Design a protein around this nucleic acid. Structure first.
Lengths: 204, 122, 117, 137, 52
RNA sequence: GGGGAGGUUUGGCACCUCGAUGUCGGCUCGUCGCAUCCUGGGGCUGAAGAAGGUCCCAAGGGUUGGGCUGUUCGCCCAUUAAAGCGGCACGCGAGCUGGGUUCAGAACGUCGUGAGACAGUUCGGUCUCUAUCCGCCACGGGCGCAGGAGGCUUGAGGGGGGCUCUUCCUAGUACGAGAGGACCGGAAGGGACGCACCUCUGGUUUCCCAGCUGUCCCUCCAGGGGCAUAAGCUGGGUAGCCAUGUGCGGAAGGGAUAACCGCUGAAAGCAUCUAAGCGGGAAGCCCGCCCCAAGAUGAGGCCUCCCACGGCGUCAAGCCGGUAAGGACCCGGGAAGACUACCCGGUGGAUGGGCCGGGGGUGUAAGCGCCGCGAGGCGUUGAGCCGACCGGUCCCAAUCGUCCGAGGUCU
RNA sequence: ACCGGAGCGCUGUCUCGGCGAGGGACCCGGUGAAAUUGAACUGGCCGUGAAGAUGCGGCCUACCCGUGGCAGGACGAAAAGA
RNA sequence: GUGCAAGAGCACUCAGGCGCGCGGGAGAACCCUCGCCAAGGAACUCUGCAAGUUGGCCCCGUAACUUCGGGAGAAGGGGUGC
RNA sequence: CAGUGGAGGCCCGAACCGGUGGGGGAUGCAAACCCCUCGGAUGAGCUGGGGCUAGGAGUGAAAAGCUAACCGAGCCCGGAGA
RNA sequence: GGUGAAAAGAACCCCGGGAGGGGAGUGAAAUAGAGCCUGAAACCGUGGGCUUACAAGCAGUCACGGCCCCGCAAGGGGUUGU
C-alpha cells in the first residue's frame, strides 16, 4: 500500500502524442518517514510521513524530541499512509511510475453555509406563477401525523464543502524527479496550496 | 446542443427545409444531442413535391450545431446553425447530393456517404 | 459562498466610490483622520495609489489624480509638497493606528489615518 | 515551493516558437493535423481571427470562415502539436480585442470594418525581405 | 400573532437557562510603557501616545 | 362451488375531533411495502437457436419527454432495460400553488306562479412577515474521560454508494431445411445520476478597460468628474463562484445465502438433495470502497515534552499565590466562516496594505507633431489604464504585554 | 385591462440552473414589541389507551447549555364551524 | 434653464429645499428588488402568469371584411448621428 | 374635385379620475397600502364651495351597493336585568 | 383618598450636569422621606446551605443513604442520590 503526501500547486493541460491530457500538479517534495507502526506495539501497520520543512521556531513544541528521535529535520505536518513500510530513509516520487493509477484524497472547497439548491442539487421551486417565497426553498420535509418526525439525515440546508474527500483510479501522467512534481488527470479536490495524500489505487 | 423542440436545417436535397426535434434517440432519456447523434423529429416545412412532405415524422442525424464539440485535441468547432440530414432507418442519408459543412465526428460513426458526398467536413 | 476573492465595503457602487474620495479629500487636507477601522483600512490603500502616483510628475498623472480629488489647488499641494517628501521611499505612504475609544451610541471602533513621517 | 506559477512553466516545454504573431482582426490560415482514416492530413483552415484569449500555455485563438455557403468557427490552442503551418494571409486593423460582432454582418459590411493595418504590413515586407539580405550575403 | 406562536410560557428555569452565555467578557487591557495607565492591546490611548 | 389473505376501491357503523382535524390535482421533498416494471439468480415449457410463456427468489437500484385534460385516470405521440403497483391524514397548503371544488356577482339549459334551486354547465372571486417545545439540518459554549501537555492514529458504531444500454472479437461456429442465430469468455463506446474540479468550452464577473447619448459641473479649448438604478448605456473580461465544461466512481475479489442444481446416504435390502456430513448457487446479505466516528461516560491506543510542597489543612479529601510542558488573550489576515469555531501568521515577521516584476484584461492614453476648410485620420504606441491571480520588497500595519496553566487519590 | 383556440416574434416560463448588485436577514452598540401561554423536568419504535401519546407499558437511543437554518409533530395559533 | 417633433413628458439642473431622527460592521443560506447568461426557445404551466421582444419621429407600403367612418399604428420595411 | 375649414360620449399621451394583471405588503408605511403594467382622459368628464333627501327610510347606470372603517335594514338612548 | 402629634418636608458637607444617593439633623417611629400609614401574592434580584452535566418526565410519593442545620440525649428540619 504505497503512499505519499503533497499539495495542490495548480493545474493545466498537456498533449500526449497528439491528444490533450488535462492535468493537475501535485508536490511530493521528499517526505521523511517520521514514525512507523508495528503491531508488535501499535496494533497495526502504517508509516507517518512528515512534510514541508520548518524553522525550529514554531517547532518549540515537544515535537522536537520526536524528530530528534527519528533524526528528522523538524517539518510542519505529518500523516499516516496505511501499511506503507518502505525502507530506512525517505520517499520521493520515484514511488509512482508514469501511467500507474492513483487514489487521491483531499479536503474540499468550503462553500460556507450553503443552500439546499446548492448542497443537494435540489429543485426548489418555480421562478414563476405564484408563491414568490420559495424559489430556492426545500419544499416539504415530512408527512402528516405518522410518523410525525423527520428522517435523521433529511437533506437540508447546512455546510457544503470543507469535508474529507477522495477521488480515485487516476492516471499519473508524468513524474518529475528532477524537481518532485506529480502529473495526474486533473480533477482533484481542494484549492491550490492545498494538502493532499496520494496512494496506489484500488483496481485489483 | 439540440434538444426536443429545436429547429434543425436540412443539409441535403431531401425535401424538408426545416424540422423540429421530437426526441433524442441517444440514451433512454438523454438531455440533448450533437453532430453524429440521431433524433426522431418532425418536418415543419418542405419544398413542393419533395421526397419528404411536411408533418413527416422523420429520423435525422445532426451534421452541424450551434454548440461547439470538444476535440480530444483540445480544439473545438461550432457552426452558425443546427442542421440535419434525414436518413433511411439503416441510418442511410435519404437525400442525394448533401450540402453544407459537417463535423469530423461523423467519420467515426459509420456515416460515410454523408461526408463522402458532403463538401467540406471541418 | 462569497469573498473567496478579496475586498470589502458597505454602501452601493457610486456611494462608496465617492466615500473613498470624500475621505481622500479630507485626508489630503488634515493629514490626520479618525474614522472607523474599516473605512480607515480602506482609505489606507486608496490614497497610497495617488501619493505614489504623485511621486510621478508628468501632467498626465496629475490629471489622473485630479480625477479622484477635484480641487486643482489640492493636487498642487500634492505634487508641490507631499510626494516630494516621499522620495527615497517606495510605497507605504500611510499609517493606520487604531484608537481605543469607541463612539457612544453604536459602539463603533475607531482609529487614525496618518501620512507617515 | 515559493513559486506556485513557475512550477507549471517547468511543465512548459511543450511550447512552440516558430509560430508568427497574429493579433485578432486579420485573416490567417492554419494547416491542421487530422486523421483521414489512419493517415495524417494538413487541413488548410483559412479564416478571420475572431478571438484570442491568452494564458502562456493553453491560450486559444478562434478563426472563422464561410465554407460553402455556411459559416464556421474552429478553435485552436496556441501550443497544440497539431498545427504544422499557420501562414497568416493579411494583417487587419481590428480596433477591438474580442470581435464577436462580425457574426451578424460577415459580408460587404466587414470589408469596411477591417481594412488592414497598412502599418504592420510595412514591418513585414521590410523585416522579411530585409532579413533575407542578412541571411543570403 | 400570525401562525407560529409559543405553546407554553417559558419556565423561568428554562429562561434563566437560555441565558447561560449572556455574560460579557470584560475588556482585555495591559499596562503601557509611557504611563502607568491601562490600555487595550494594539490601541493608542490618552495620557500617553507613541513613537512615530 | 368453496376457503382466505390484504385494508389501495364503493360502502356500513357514527368512536375521537364542529370554543375548527383546510377537501381534489399539480410542484417540491420524499419514505416505506412487495403482491417485481426493469436489471441479477432459478423450475418448468406445447423451451431447436433467437425470442417469448408461466411459477419462484429477490427491493439494491432504476422506473422517460411531450400532445389533451383542473384533473388522479386514461388516449395518443417519440422513445425505453423499464416506462411497476400501494402505503404514508388518498404523505406533504405554520412548504408552494389555487386550475378544480363549497360563499357574495353573472348567465345558459332546467324545476319552480314565485323568491330561489340544480354531484348540471359557464366567467370572476383576499391561502396570515416573526417557530416557544419535539423532531431535523448545520455550528458552538460547559463539563467530562482520576497527573498536565503537543502531535498522530485504532474504528466499536453509523452513513454514503449500489443503475443500466449498444456495439465489435470469440463465430457467423453449436443450433436450424433456411430465415434466424447463441451459451461462454473477452474488448471498446453511451445515457442517466453522484463526487469533486476550473485546465480547455462556457456563464457571471458592481467600476477591470474602452465606446456613447443627455446634462450639470471643474476651467474657455483639449482633458475630466456627477447623474441618468440601488451599474446611465453598449462592446469586452482574470481571479473567484460556476455547468453545458474536465477527471472519478457504481467495481474486482473473499465469505454467508435466496429460489434452485448436486455428492455420499439411512430410516424403508430399492430409491431419496438430508434426517448425520459435504459441495455449487443473486445486482440481494456481510466485508470490501468512500465519509462520519472514543460524550465507543465501555470516553481507547501510539511517539514525544514537563515534573514533588512554595503556604494554611496534623489525621480526610482539600484549600492559596507562583510556576513546568504548553495553552489562551489580542492583533494581522485565509479558497474558513452567519456568529463562533477551524487554519497560517505576529518584527526571529512577508500576515495583510503599499510598491515593483511577471500574468491577465482592455485595444494604440495624455501630450505634441504631420494632413484635411472640417468631422477626423496617421505617428510617436500593443500605448496609457491595468481588482482578486503568480512571486518578490519591511515602506505601513500584527509594537509592548496580560491572564491561564503540573505539584501528580487509593489497592 | 371580458372569456376561448392557434401561429410569428422573444424571452430564465422551462430543460437547469449559475454568477453578480443592492434591502433585510446574520455579528456588535442604543431601543425594544406580539399573538400565545394549565403546569413542565416536553426523545425513537411497537404496542396501548375515547380509536392519531414526550406524559401509560415494553423496548431503543440519549452528557449539560445554546446559535443560524428547515417546517413533520405538539390533532400547532387565530375565529365558542360559515 | 438645456436636449428629445411637441409637452405640466423625460433626463440633468436653477433659485429654493432636502439626505426621509438608530448607527457600526460582516458579505452564509433564505426573502425581497435588480442586472446577465452558454444551447434550446412555451418543452413551463390551468393559461406565454410573469418577464421579454416592440417602441420616437419621417418615409415607403398595408389584406380580409366594411355601417364605406373604418379595419390603420393592419401587416412588413427603410431612415435617423456627425 | 381640390382647397379652406375644425366637428367627434373620435384617436395617442401628462395633469386629473380610475383600479386591470402580477409581484410585495398581511402583529403592514397602511383596519386597503406600495411598485411594474393597465383603463377613461372635451365627457354620461373631474373637482372646490354652498345646499336638499335617512331607518322599512333615503340614494342607487342595480351590488342588495351606500347611508361616518362589518348595512338582507344605520347609530345612540330607552322598554331591558327582552 | 392616607407622611406626621406637629413640616419639625431633611441646613451644611460628600459623589453626581441632573436624577439620585452617603453621613449629619428633625421625629417616639424615616424599613412614617413625600403618591410617603399598614405593605400581602404574583413577579424580578443578591448572599448562603443542600443539589445536578449516562440522565427518560403530571415532577409528586414511600424507603434508605450522604451533606447542612437546631438539640445533653432520643429526636426535628432543609436538601436529594438510589
Amino acid at each position: 500500500m504505497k503512499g505519499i503526501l503533497g499539495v495542490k500547486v495548480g493545474m493545466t493541460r498537456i498533449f500526449r502524442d497528439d491528444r490533450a491530457v488535462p492535468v493537475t500538479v501535485i508536490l511530493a517534495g521528499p517526505c521523511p518517514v517520521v514514525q512507523r507502526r508495528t503491531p508488535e506495539k501499535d496494533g497495526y501497520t502504517a508509516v507517518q510521513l512528515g512534510f514541508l520543512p520548518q524553522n525550529p521556531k514554531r517547532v518549540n513544541r515537544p515535537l522536537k524530541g520526536h524528530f530528534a528521535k527519528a533524526g528528522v529535520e523538524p517539518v510542519r505536518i505529518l500523516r499516516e499512509i496505511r501499511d506503507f513500510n518502505p525502507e530506512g530513509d525517505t520517499v520521493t516520487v520515484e514511488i509512482f511510475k508514469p501511467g500507474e493509477r492513483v487514489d487521491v484524497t483531499g479536503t474540499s472547497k468550503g462553500r460556507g453555509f450553503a443552500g439546499v439548491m446548492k448542497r443537494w442539487n435540489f429543485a426548489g421551486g418555480p421562478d414563476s406563477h405564484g408563491a414568490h417565497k420559495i424559489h430556492r426553498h426545500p419544499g416539504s420535509i415530512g408527512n402528516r401525523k405518522t410518523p410525525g418526525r423527520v428522517y435523521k439525515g433529511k437533506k437540508m440546508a447546512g455546510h457544503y464543502g470543507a469535508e474529507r474527500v477522495t477521488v480515485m483510479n487516476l492516471e499519473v501522467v508524468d513524474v518529475i524527479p528532477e524537481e518532485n512534481l506529480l502529473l495526474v488527470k486533473g480533477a482533484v479536490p481542494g484549492p491550490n496550496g492545498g494538502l493532499v495524500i496520494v496512494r496506489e489505487t484500488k483496481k485489483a | 446542443m439540440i434538444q426536443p423542440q429545436t429547429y434543425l436545417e436540412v443539409a441535403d436535397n431531401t425535401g424538408a427545409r426545416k424540422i423540429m426535434c421530437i426526441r433524442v434517440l441517444k440514451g433512454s432519456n438523454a438531455k440533448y444531442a450533437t453532430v453524429g447523434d440521431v433524433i426522431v423529429a418532425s418536418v415543419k416545412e418542405a419544398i413542393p413535391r419533395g421526397a419528404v412532405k411536411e408533418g413527416d415524422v422523420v429520423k435525422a442525424v445532426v451534421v452541424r450545431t450551434k454548440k461547439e464539440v470538444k476535440r480530444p485535441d483540445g480544439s473545438a468547432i461550432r457552426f452558425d446553425d443546427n442542421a440535419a440530414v434525414i436518413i433511411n432507418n439503416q441510418l442511410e442519408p435519404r437525400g442525394t447530393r448533401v450540402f453544407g459543412p459537417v463535423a469530423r465526428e461523423l467519420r467515426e460513426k459509420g456515416f460515410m456517404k454523408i461526408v463522402s458526398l458532403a463538401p467540406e467536413v471541418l | 459562498r462569497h469573498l473567496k476573492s478579496g475586498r470589502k465595503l458597505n454602501r452601493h457602487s457610486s456611494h462608496r466610490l465617492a466615500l473613498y474620495r470624500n475621505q481622500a479629500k479630507s485626508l489630503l487636507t488634515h493629514g490626520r483622520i479618525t474614522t472607523t477601522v474599516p473605512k480607515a483600512k480602506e482609505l489606507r490603500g486608496f490614497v497610497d495609489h495617488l501619493i505614489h502616483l504623485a511621486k510621478r510628475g508628468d501632467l498626465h498623472a496629475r490629471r489622473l489624480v485630479l480625477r479622484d480629488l477635484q480641487d486643482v489647488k489640492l493636487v498642487r499641494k500634492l505634487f508641490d509638497e507631499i510626494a516630494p517628501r516621499y522620495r527615497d521611499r517606495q510605497g507605504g505612504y500611510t499609517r493606520v493606528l487604531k484608537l481605543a475609544e469607541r463612539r457612544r451610541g453604536d459602539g463603533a471602533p475607531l482609529a487614525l489615518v496618518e501620512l507617515v513621517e | 515551493m515559493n513559486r506556485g506559477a513557475l512550477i507549471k512553466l517547468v511543465e512548459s516545454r511543450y511550447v512552440r516558437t516558430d509560430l508568427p504573431e497574429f493579433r485578432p482582426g486579420d485573416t490567417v490560415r492554419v494547416s491542421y493535423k487530422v486523421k483521414e482514416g489512419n493517415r495524417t492530413r494538413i487541413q488548410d483552415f483559412e479564416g478571420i481571427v475572431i478571438r484570442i484569449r491568452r494564458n502562456g500555455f493553453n491560450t486559444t485563438f478562434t478563426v472563422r470562415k464561410v465554407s460553402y455557403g455556411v459559416g464556421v468557427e474552429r478553435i485552436f490552442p496556441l501550443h497544440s502539436p497539431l498545427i504544422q503551418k499557420i501562414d497568416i494571409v493579411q494583417r487587419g486593423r481590428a480596433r477591438r480585442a474580442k470581435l464577436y460582432f462580425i457574426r451578424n454582418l460577415s459580408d460587404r459590411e466587414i470589408r469596411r470594418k477591417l481594412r488592414a493595418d497598412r502599418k504592420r504590413i510595412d514591418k513585414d515586407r521590410a523585416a522579411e525581405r530585409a532579413a533575407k539580405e542578412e541571411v543570403q550575403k | 400573532a400570525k401562525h407560529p406562536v409559543p405553546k407554553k410560557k417559558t419556565s423561568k428555569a428554562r429562561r434563566d437557562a437560555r441565558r447561560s452565555h449572556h455574560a460579557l467578557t470584560p475588556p482585555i487591557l495591559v499596562p503601557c510603557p509611557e504611563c502607568k495607565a491601562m490600555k487595550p492591546p494594539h490601541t493608542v490611548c490618552p495620557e500617553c501616545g507613541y513613537y512615530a
